[PDB]
Amino acid sequence: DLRGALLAGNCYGCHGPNGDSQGGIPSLSGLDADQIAETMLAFRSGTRESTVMQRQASGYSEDEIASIAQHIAQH
Amino acid sequence: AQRVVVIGGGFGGSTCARYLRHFDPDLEVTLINPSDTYTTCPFSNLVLGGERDLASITHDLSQLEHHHGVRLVQRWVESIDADGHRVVLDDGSAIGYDRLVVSPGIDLRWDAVEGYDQAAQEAMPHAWRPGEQTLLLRRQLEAMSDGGVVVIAPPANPFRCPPGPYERASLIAHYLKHHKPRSKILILDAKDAFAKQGLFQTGWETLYPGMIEWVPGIEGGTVERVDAATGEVFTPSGRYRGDVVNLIPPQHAGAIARNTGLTDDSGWCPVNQQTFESLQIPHIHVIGDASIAGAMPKAGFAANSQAKVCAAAVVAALHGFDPTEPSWSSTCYSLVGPEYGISVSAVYRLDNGSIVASEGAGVSPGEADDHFRQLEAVYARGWYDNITAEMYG
Amino acid sequence: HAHLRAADPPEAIVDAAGLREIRLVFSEPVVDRFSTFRAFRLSLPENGIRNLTQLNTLASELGVDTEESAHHEVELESDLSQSAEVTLHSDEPLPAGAYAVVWRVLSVDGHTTTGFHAFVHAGG
Amino acid sequence: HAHLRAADPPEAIVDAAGLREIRLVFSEPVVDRFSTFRAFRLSLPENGIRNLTQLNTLASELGVDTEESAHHEVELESDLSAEVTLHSDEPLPAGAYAVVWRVLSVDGHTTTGFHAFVHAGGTA
Ligand SMILES: *Cc1cc2c(cc1C)nc1c(=O)[nH]c(=O)nc-1n2C[C@H](O)[C@H](O)[C@H](O)COP(=O)(O)OP(=O)(O)OC[C@H]1O[C@@H](n2cnc3c(N)ncnc32)[C@H](O)[C@@H]1O
Ligand code: HEC
Ligand SMILES: [Cu+2]
């Protein structure tokens, strides 16, 4: 669906086209749903320290985080 | 075969063209832009600070045709036939559309600051549109003798990239600190507050102490008049002279949006907050700086973000389905110095027909260490190479 | 053409405690009846000027014609029929400042020119 | 050690009407008791000065250890934590000025320097 595509599309803005980073910001492509979701939430609550990932991660609900997670790994 | 014509190959349009083919590869997608190449205003501050050149921030649009099958037309769009669903070019040719995406960026308001018309831009460059102007200002900074004063006059909201003038100050300072250490920067602001003000000022105090003076509008910082002949800026606190002066005039939507009647009184384009279809001419969509997008800054990231939602929405409209619920994000990274980075960042969400920031949005933390600034600098360059890859790879 | 060849105060920053006399020397003589001289204390930019080119630029917005301006006029008395040597008086001495002397002059060759001379009077 | 990063008034010619203080900003803080500031109103030559290099020449003649000189010293009460504001009770008259210092940082290093400017008068 387009819903998931829009939730996810913005991640490519920093993380590179379909998760392939040119550098600096880590890559996304070589990660599965579970890893993505589990660290989104980790950044969100603070558990995992971010420079900007909490600012971004906090912008999403737990449901949306699952959609984003799925869609990036599937694609 | 259904047709989408996209006007402009910058942050908005190129992202739109690519995503249109991603969302429906059955579309005949034509993107129109005066040039085979695009130079980014982002990172042009590093050109001003003599860290890169214009080539290093210029990109080929050819990949959109070669790889993603977007017909790339190198022309100016002169006229929009809204009724006849056609676009007229500068060569006299025409190109028809079932749905039109307009992402033309900004024009400078020539009638806004007394003294500053089209002719004033050679001596008193804005450089708010990159290329020729970036080049002119840098050559000025290079020719300025040590001990001179650079004047930067940013405008009132709203304008393209609200931190941009303050990163410009920062990086010009970086160039001055290592080549012209006596030189001074003077910001004559129309506003009483700016983006990431706390962060910039702490950055300036530590990287460029004593280099930079900031005068708010409330203390007579506003530019009422300028004299392009004499490097003079006139303000309620008096007359100032700059050895180099960067005047940044208030802005509005690109000519094509204005001329076509897509803009309202404010000089920006009102649009359906969900679909970015124009609230004024049906079947034309407006993205990027030219749009009125609620909370969303006039930033490159925003344009790119808006482009995605827009692509999705036009395929929705072209295949007779309801538009989906949309999501956006924007993040403006500023390099206070090449190894000192700060950010303002947000995710966006429709809330009562208005685009609004989610909770969580904010600027870099106030009381952080040097490592943190270094990292955000690394990440800024990451974003830059990444987002341009997405548009032009 | 009657051009400025020399002047006192000269084109510089000078201590001139009681300045009451400004002297102009022109390349040809000059017709009193058809020559005008005016003089202004320049109100400098807030962040000031850094050299004499900037004195001159600023001084050149004035001219014998000018009306209301940023600057402040100092009433003068010409002391001359025909002469290459013009001398300008004020009863009281001049406050310190950047000054511009602007003229329109008829040469004896029949030509009209305009011009200016600028200096900085530092006090003393 | 302790270099000057900014000064008010700037190293320029200015209309500083009744200037009652001079403000200096250094790269790091500066020890009060051990640091001395002196200010001199410059006596400019007959011919005057044509630019800032020549003003900076004229100031480098002076120093903190300076007894007999061409120029007139001025009484300043000093207030020092990297900004120094030199104060005078009386507003300063028009002049080319020099401020000169010997300055001790907290690492025990000394740095001397000068900052010159031209105050060209004007009114309140
Ligand atoms: C000036 C500036 C901007 C800036 C920045 C720093 C500076 C100094 N830093 C940024 C940053 O760190 N992060 C960020 O997200 N944005 C930053 N920006 C802003 C960014 O430049 C703009 O917000 C962005 O450009 C907006 O995108 P948009 O697509 O709306 O405008 P554009 O990129 O300029 O592209 C417009 C293109 O279309 C062509 N054009 C215009 N009219 C026509 C017609 N009639 N026909 C054909 N082509 C047209 C233009 O030539 C241009 O290529
Ligand atoms: C969806 C919209 C997004 C997903 C899913 C992810 N991001 Fe990012 N991201 C960014 C930076 C600079 C970092 C490094 C961490 C930091 O300093 O904050 C990250 C990190 C991640 C990670 C951890 C990766 C790892 O290998 O350890 C994941 C799973 C991740 N991000 C997913 C930058 C940005 C950014 C900048 C403007 C945006 C919009 C996003 N990230 C968005 C998403
Ligand atoms: Cu003649």
Taking a C-beta distance cutoff of 8 angstroms, is the pair B388, A12 a contact?
no
Angle separating helix axes A33-45 and A62-74, nearest 10 degrees: 140
Cβ contact (<8 Å) for D5 and B211?
Answer: yes
The amino acid that residue D10 corresponds to is P
| Beta carbon of B314 within 6 Å of any ligand 1 atom | no
| Beta carbon of B41 within 6 Å of any ligand 1 atom | yes
Q: Looking at the partner chain, which of C43, C51, C119 has a beta carbon nearest the beta carbon of D15?
A: C43
Beta carbons within 8 Å of B156's beta carbon, 6+ residues apart: B190, B191, B217, B250
Any known ligand binding at A71?
no
The amino acid that residue D73 corresponds to is E
Distance CA B361, CA B331 (A): 10
Taking a C-beta distance cutoff of 8 angstroms, is the pair B107, B217 a contact?
no
Cβ contact (<8 Å) for C47 and B148?
Answer: no
Residue spans of the domains in chain A: they are: 1-75
Q: Does residue C9 have a cis peptide bond before it, meaning omega lies within 30 degrees of 0?
A: yes
A39 C-alpha to center of ligand 2: Å? 9
Distance CA C77, CA B387 (A): 71
Q: Is residue C63 classed as helix, strand or coil in its secondary structure?
A: coil
Q: Tell whether the torsion through CA atoms of D41, D47, D48 and D54 is positive or negative.
A: negative
Q: With 0-12 CB in 10 A as exposed, 13-18 as middle and 19+ as buried, what is C65?
A: exposed
Encoded tokens for B259: 């001329």
Residue owning the nearest CA to atom 30 of ligand 1: B288
Closest CA to B125 of B87, B90, B168: B168
Cα–Cα distances in Å, from B63 out to B22, B286, B393, C101?
14, 23, 6, 65
Q: For residue B305, what is the DSSP state?
A: H
CA closest to B236 among chain C residues: C46
Please report, for chain C, how many H helices and E strands are present, in that order: 1, 9
Find how far residue C41's CA is from the centre of its chain.
10
B138 C-alpha to center of ligand 1: Å? 20
B87-B91-B92-B93 Cα dihedral, nearest 10 degrees: -60
| Beta carbon of B104 within 6 Å of any ligand 1 atom | yes
The single residue listed with the structure tokens 């349009």 is: B13
Q: Give the start-end residues of each E strand in chain D.
A: 4-8, 13-14, 21-26, 36-42, 72-74, 77-79, 83-87, 95-104, 110-119
Q: With 0-12 CB in 10 A as exposed, 13-18 as middle and 19+ as buried, what is B231?
A: buried
Cβ contact (<8 Å) for C49 and D93?
Answer: no
**Other CB atoms within 10 A of residue B263 CB:** 21
Distance CA B158, CA B109 (A): 12
Cα–Cα distances in Å, from D82 out to B47, B209, D25, D33, D87?
33, 11, 6, 14, 16
Residue owning the nearest CA to atom 1 of ligand 2: A11
Per-residue b or e along A30-56, where b marks 16 or more CB atoms closer than 10 Å to that residue's CB: eeebeebbebbbbbbeeeeeebbbbbb
| Beta carbon of B128 within 6 Å of any ligand 1 atom | yes
Per-residue b or e along C93-115, where b marks 16 or more CB atoms closer than 10 Å to that residue's CB: ebbbbbbbbbbbbbbeeeeebeb
Write out the DSSP string of D52-73: HHHHHHHHHT--SS--S-SSEE
Distance CA D39, CA D115 (A): 9
Taking a C-beta distance cutoff of 8 angstroms, is the pair B151, B168 a contact?
no
CA closest to B177 among chain D residues: D5
A56 C-alpha to center of ligand 2: Å? 8
Distance CA A52, CA A54 (A): 6
Q: Does residue C95 have a cis peptide bond before it, meaning omega lies within 30 degrees of 0?
A: no
Q: Looking at the partner chain, which of B182, B184, B209 has a beta carbon nearest the beta carbon of D27?
A: B209
Method: X-ray
Q: Give the start-end residues of each E strand in B90-211.
A: 94-96, 99-102, 106-108, 149-153, 184-188
**Other CB atoms within 10 A of residue B31 CB:** 26
Encoded tokens for B48: 């001003």
CATH no. for B117-250: 3.50.50.60
The amino acid that residue A22 corresponds to is Q
Beta carbons within 8 Å of B295's beta carbon, 6+ residues apart: B346, B348, B354, B355, B356, B357
Beta carbons within 8 Å of B14's beta carbon, 6+ residues apart: B8, B31, B38, B61, B64, B307, B391, B392
| Beta carbon of B44 within 6 Å of any ligand 1 atom | yes
Q: Mutation test of the interface with chain C: which of B230, B233, B237, choosing the one with the most C Cβ atoms within 10 A?
A: B230
Find how far residue B64's CA is from the centre of its chain.
21
Encoded tokens for B67: 């790889």
Q: Looking at the partner chain, which of C54, C61, C70 has a beta carbon nearest the beta carbon of B241?
A: C54
Distance CA C99, CA A44 (A): 66
Q: For residue B250, what is the DSSP state?
A: -
What is the CATH T-level fold of the domain B323-393, as seen in this structure? Flavocytochrome C Sulfide Dehydrogenase; Chain A Domain 3 (3.90.760)
Residue owning the nearest CA to atom 20 of ligand 1: B300
Please state the φ and ψ torsions of residue A6, each to the nearest 5 degrees.
Answer: -75, -40
**What is the span of the domain harbouring residue D96?**
1-124
The single residue listed with the structure tokens 């009681």 is: C18
**Other CB atoms within 10 A of residue B143 CB:** 10
Beta carbons within 8 Å of B383's beta carbon, 6+ residues apart: A13, A14, A24, A25, B301, B331, B333
Resolution in A: 2.6
Cβ contact (<8 Å) for D25 and B210?
Answer: yes
Q: Do domains B1-116+251-322 and B323-393 have the same CATH topology?
A: no
Taking a C-beta distance cutoff of 8 angstroms, is the pair C44, D120 a contact?
yes
Can chain C be said to touch chain B, i.e. do they have 3 or more Cβ pairs within 8 angstroms?
A: yes
Tell me which chains share at least 3 CB pairs under 8 Å with chain D. Answer: B, C
Cα–Cα distances in Å, from C76 out to B137, C20, C86, C95, D65?
44, 9, 12, 14, 46
Closest CA to B185 of B217, B144, B237: B144
Q: Does residue D9 have a cis peptide bond before it, meaning omega lies within 30 degrees of 0?
A: yes
CATH H-level, domain B1-116+251-322: superfamily: FAD/NAD(P)-binding domain (3.50.50.60)
**Other CB atoms within 10 A of residue B354 CB:** 11
Beta carbons within 8 Å of B224's beta carbon, 6+ residues apart: B113, B114, B234, B235, B236
- Residues tagged in the binding site annotation of D for Cu(2+): 1, 107, 109
| Beta carbon of A13 within 6 Å of any ligand 2 atom | yes
C113 C-alpha to center of ligand 3: Å? 8
Cβ contact (<8 Å) for D50 and C15?
Answer: no
Taking a C-beta distance cutoff of 8 angstroms, is the pair B391, B18 a contact?
yes
- Residues tagged in the binding site annotation of B: 11-12, 33, 38, 41, 77, 103, 160, 289, 300-301
Angle separating helix axes A62-74 and A2-15, nearest 10 degrees: 80
Residue spans of the domains in chain B: they are: 1-116+251-322, 117-250, 323-393
CATH H-level, domain A1-75: superfamily: Cytochrome c-like domain (1.10.760.10)
Closest CA to B152 of B242, B48, B40: B242
The arrangement of strands across the sheet holding B225-227 comes to B225-227, B232-235, B238-241
